[PDB]
Amino acid sequence: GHAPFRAQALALDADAALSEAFPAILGNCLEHIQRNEVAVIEGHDPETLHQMRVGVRRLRSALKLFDAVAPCPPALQDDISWLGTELGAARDWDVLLASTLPRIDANGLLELNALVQKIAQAKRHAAAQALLSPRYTRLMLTLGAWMLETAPLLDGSAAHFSRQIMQHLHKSLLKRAARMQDDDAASAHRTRIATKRGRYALEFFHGLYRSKSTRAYLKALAATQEELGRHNDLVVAGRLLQELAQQQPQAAEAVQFARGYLLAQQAMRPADLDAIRAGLHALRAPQLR
Ligand SMILES: [Zn+2]
């Protein structure tokens, strides 16, 4: 309520088992979602919604790496996708209003800003209703119950599991950054998600790896995510405004002006792959300690 909740720092023991790490990682993800509930329902704060959306993304990536040892039931995965879409739609409209539209310097953009704010507030109300619905509360309860049941069934230490995942994710990131080509949406998106997956996994198994080696690895990853995410916000804005033009034909002139400005920003300032390649060419897989 009122205050935004950021993901709690998870410091796992070096000698900790997989049966101890799995409920600690997923529990941290569920807490990150739960502690933002009230503020997303009652308020309109963008950071509280941002933190809840990130929490859902962190949970989905955690279930993806744990999929081999503990596969999540398909019914829960459908509800996680529903929750991600509901909070995601509200987040997309908030990014457009606070970050994508203000960087646009023809005079009819004031009424467009009022229309976008109206949609963003309505999407926040729609997200609030999704959280108050029994579908959400049942999902959080069923996920927690499944987490605790599957936890003692896992074999080996956390260090043995993390090294296999970290080797695959570093291999996946470097491969996608090399296969990456200019003006290709599919390759740029694959690199951005490999950057997110790698950042989350290293934050989950934080107390298992070297303090100064991971800090430099996370810095190079966060910089790559910031660059590819900047170009991604521009293409999402163009998609959201084109959808708004079809539903609201009255503000179409103001929409097309904003769409024209953003389409040019995509061509004039594309995702600087050369700076990304130079930022990731030196990176070595973080070693256990
Ligand atoms: Zn309201």
Author numbering: 7 to 111, 117 to 289, 292 to 294, 296 to 303
Give verbatim lines from the article.
Here, we report that bacterial, archaeal, and eukaryotic conserved histidine α-helical (CHAD) domains are specific polyP-binding modules. All CHAD domains fold into two 4-helix bundles with up-down-up-down topology. Analysis of the surface charge distribution in the different CHAD domains revealed a highly basic central cavity, which is surrounded by two basic surface patches on each side. The basic amino acids contributing to these surface patches are highly conserved among different CHAD proteins.
We identified an expressed CHAD domain–containing protein in the plant R. communis L. (RcCHAD), which represents the only CHAD domain currently known in plants. We selected CHAD domain–containing proteins belonging to the three kingdoms of life: archaea (Sulfolobus solfataricus; termed SsCHAD hereafter), bacteria (Chlorobium tepidum; CtCHAD), and eukaryota (Ricinus communis or castor bean; RcCHAD). We, thus, used the moderate anomalous signal present in the native RcCHAD dataset to locate a single Zn2+ ion. The structure was solved using the single-wavelength anomalous dispersion method, and the refined model revealed a Zn2+ ion tetrahedrally coordinated by His50 and His136 originating from two symmetry-related RcCHAD molecules. Although we found a Zn2+ ion coordinated by two histidine residues in our RcCHAD structure, the contributing histidines are not conserved among CHAD family proteins, and no metal ions could be located in our CtCHAD and ygiF structures. This makes it unlikely that CHAD domains are metal-binding proteins. Notably, helices α4/α5 and α10/α11 are protruding the bundle cores in the RcCHAD and CtCHAD structures, forming a small pore in the center of the domain, which we find to be absent in our ygiF structure. This rationalizes the presence of “long” (∼300 amino acids, e.g., RcCHAD and CtCHAD) and “short” (∼200 amino acids, e.g., ygiF and SsCHAD) CHAD domains. RcCHAD and SsCHAD bind polyP with a one-to-one kinetics and with a KD of 6 μM and 45 nM, respectively. We found that the fusion protein specifically localized to the nucleus and nucleolus of hypocotyl and root cells.
